[PDB]
Design a binder for this molecule. Structure first.
Ligand SMILES: C[C@]12CCCO[C@@H]1[C@]1(COC(N)=N1)c1cc(-c3cccnc3F)ccc1O2
Ligand code: NI
Length: 393
């Protein structure tokens, strides 16, 4: 999969994107790679943050579906018109498919100034597609229309402009050059988000000792479309307390722990060793087994270059509170080669050949850990009448 290696780009904290083409003749757009959503949607009208957009009128193969779509979220929305057109990934498989495309005609706090992407590729399942689960997601169409295996894998690699990032999205396979050591699999609990189960959390080798359901309240997901490691309120509080205690030689402002303020050291003198490793134990394929993924401060402290002090190394704390469960975002994924094995309903982790580390510690993937009579760590989201009333024909 040499032709697919190094096909992702982006700016730190602003998402990873892949080049895609839409229409006939092909119109190139940069598309956010998002395992936390399920729509393929592209800017299709002028916007202050867009240099270019999908021009449906220029495409001989465009078909209007005569249906609108409206997608609200916390402090924003995108909306537009549904259609289909021919889509390819220039640095991906040598195939062209007819996919659903949402042509974004209006948005609020969707596009990001300077992110260099013009659309979003939702790689998650139909259950969370808008307007409903009958709108076939891109990857489903790709698999159904081509001989491409039902699997993709992601290797995300972490003064006036933000830092450039790179990575690989390998579609239809696993590239052995992108990882070292063992590849460990956790089950996809349910096909909507890429939902997984965390059975144990340690901070510098010390167990948080919480009821494991707390780790997955109200879900845990693997999400390339979220920058941070996001943790449920109670878990976040325990983690922050433990990390503060380890790094206690340094007294940072409250703003730092909230992700609202940078902390700096003189260039090259960052005391990495005062910050603890964080281990998340994920449910194994075998009932009473787990494996752990371990990340370093190099992953959860994000570099941000400061104009006012360019001779310092400055960092943002990239673990944040969630009210919608654990989110294993770019902070987690940058440690690892992550295999989204849809065919076998499982997610694989191995140490990334590109992860940032030092001479003392490394991001790790280790197992098995067996637990006699393992508890159920999964949370069952209370069923609303809304959800219950839906028929699924
Ligand atoms: C809010 C939605 C539209 C509705 C569905 O969720 C989308 C979301 C939020 O979380 C994920 N997984 N994708 C999303 C993430 C980013 C982003 C921003 C910064 C860095 N990386 C990114 F992916 C930008 C836009 C965006 O749009
Ligand atoms: Ni019915």
């Amino acid at each position: 999969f040499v032709e697919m290696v190094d096909n992702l780009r982006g700016k730190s904290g602003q998402g990873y994107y892949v080049e895609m083409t839409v229409g006939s003749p092909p119109q190139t757009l940069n598309i956010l790679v998002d395992t936390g959503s399920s729509n393929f949607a592209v800017g299709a009208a002028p916007h202050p943050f867009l240099h270019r957009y999908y021009q449906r009128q220029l495409s001989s193969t465009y078909r209007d579906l005569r249906k609108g779509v409206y997608v609200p979220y916390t402090q924003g929305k995108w909306e537009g018109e549904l259609g289909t057109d021919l889509v390819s990934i220039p640095h991906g498989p040598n195939v062209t498919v007819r996919a659903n495309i949402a042509a974004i005609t209006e948005s609020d706090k969707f596009f990001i100034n300077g992110s260099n992407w013009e659309g979003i590729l939702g790689l998650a399942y139909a259950e969370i597609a808008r307007p409903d689960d009958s709108l076939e997601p891109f990857f489903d169409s790709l698999v159904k229309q081509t001989h491409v295996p039902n699997l993709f894998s992601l290797q995300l690699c972490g003064s006036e402009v933000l830092a450039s990032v790179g990575g690989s999205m390998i579609i239809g396979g696993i590239d052995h050059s992108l990882y070292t050591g063992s590849l460990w699999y956790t089950p996809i609990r349910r096909e909507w988000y890429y939902e997984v189960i965390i059975v144990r959390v340690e901070i510098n080798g010390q167990d948080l000792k919480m009821d494991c359901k707390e780790y997955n309240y109200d879900k845990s997901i693997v999400d390339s479309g979220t920058t941070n490691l996001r943790l449920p309120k109670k878990v976040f509080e325990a983690a922050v307390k433990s990390i503060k205690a380890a790094s206690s030689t340094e007294k940072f402002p409250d703003g730092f722990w909230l992700g609202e303020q940078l902390v700096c050291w003189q260039a090259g003198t960052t005391p990495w060793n005062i910050f603890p490793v964080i281990s998340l134990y994920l449910m194994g394929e075998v009932t009473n087994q787990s494996f752990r993924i371990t990340i370093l401060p190099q992953q959860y402290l994000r570099p941000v270059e400061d104009v006012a002090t360019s001779q310092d190394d400055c960092y943002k704390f990239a673990i944040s509170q969630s009210s919608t469960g654990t989110v294993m975002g770019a902070v987690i994924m940058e440690g690892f080669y992550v295999v989204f094995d849809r065919a076998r309903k499982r997610i694989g982790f191995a140490v990334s050949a590109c992860h940032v580390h030092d001479e003392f510690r490394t991001a790790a993937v280790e197992g098995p850990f067996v637990t006699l009579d393992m508890e159920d760590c999964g949370y069952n989201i209370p069923q609303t009448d809304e959800s219950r009333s839906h028929h699924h024909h």
